[PDB]
């Protein structure tokens, strides 16, 4: 642009970070509504164990359970965190393994 036009707009300003699933908090605590399964997207396939949780912010959201195997029923409270799962379209949250009612993965016995 010209010097006038650059004077008239001011310098460019970095837009504030748009906020995600955890609303800018590191974790959230939430209760399990339902446990189900979702297929990944096309190029690569499995069936991934997810749950639906209600979060302390009152918002209800699909969330994913890492590790192989798990015990989760309705009414269990879990703690969820921000990592997005690449296969699953739409699923932006992850259960923290090892807290409240989600226990660490049990080594094969």
Partner RNA sequence: CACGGGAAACAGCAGUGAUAAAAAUUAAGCCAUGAACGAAAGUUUGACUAAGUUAUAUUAAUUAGAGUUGGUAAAUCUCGUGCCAGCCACCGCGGUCAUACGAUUAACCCAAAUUAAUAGAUCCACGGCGUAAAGAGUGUUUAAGAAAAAAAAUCACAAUAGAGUUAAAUUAUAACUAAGCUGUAAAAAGCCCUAGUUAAAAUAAAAUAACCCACGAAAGUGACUCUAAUAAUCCUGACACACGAUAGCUAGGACCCAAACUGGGAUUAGAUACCCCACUAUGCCUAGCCCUAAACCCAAAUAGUUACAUAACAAAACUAUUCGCCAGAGUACUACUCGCAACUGCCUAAAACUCAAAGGACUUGGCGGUGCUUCACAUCCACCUAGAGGAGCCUGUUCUAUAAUCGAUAAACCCCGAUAGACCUUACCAACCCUUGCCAAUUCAGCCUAUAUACCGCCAUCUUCAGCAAACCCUAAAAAGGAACAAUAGUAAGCACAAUCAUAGCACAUAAAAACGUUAGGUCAAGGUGUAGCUUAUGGGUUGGAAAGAAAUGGGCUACA
Residue numbering of the annotated binding site: 98, 104
The residue among 83 and 90 lying less far from Mg ion, judged by its C-beta, is 83
Contact 93, 61 (CB under 8 A): yes
Q: How many CA atoms lie less than 13 Å away from 91 in the CB half-sphere?
A: 25
In angstroms, the Cα distances linking 50 to 11, 12, 94, 95 are 46, 42, 9, 9
The residue among 39 and 74 lying less far from RNA, judged by its C-beta, is 39
Contact 40, 46 (CB under 8 A): yes
**Smallest gap from residue 14 Cβ to Mg ion (A):** 15
Q: Which of 36, 45, 74, 98 binds RNA (CB under 7 A)?
A: 45
**Smallest gap from residue 49 Cβ to RNA (A):** 5
Question: DSSP character for 98?
Answer: T
DSSP helix/strand/coil, 60: strand
Per-residue binding letters, 67-86, with Mg ion (x by CB under 5 A): ----------------x---
Positions in the binding site for Mg ion (CB under 5 A): 44, 83
The site for RNA (CB under 7 A) is made up of 1-6, 11-20, 22, 24-29, 40-41, 44-49, 55-56, 66-69, 79, 81-87, 89-90, 107-108
């Amino acid at each position: 642009a010209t010097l006038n036009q650059m004077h008239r707009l001011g310098p460019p300003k970095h837009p504030p970070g748009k906020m995600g699933p955890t609303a800018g908090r590191p974790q959230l605590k939430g209760v399990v509504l339902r446990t189900f399964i979702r297929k990944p997207k096309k190029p690569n396939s499995a069936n991934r164990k997810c749950c639906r949780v209600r979060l302390s912010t009152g918002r209800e959201a699909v969330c994913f359970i890492p590790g192989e195997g798990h015990s989760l029923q309705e009414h269990h409270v879990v703690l969820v965190q921000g990592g997005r799962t690449q296969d699953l379209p739409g699923v932006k949250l992850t259960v923290v393994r090892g807290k409240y009612d989600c226990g660490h993965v049990q080594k094969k016995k």
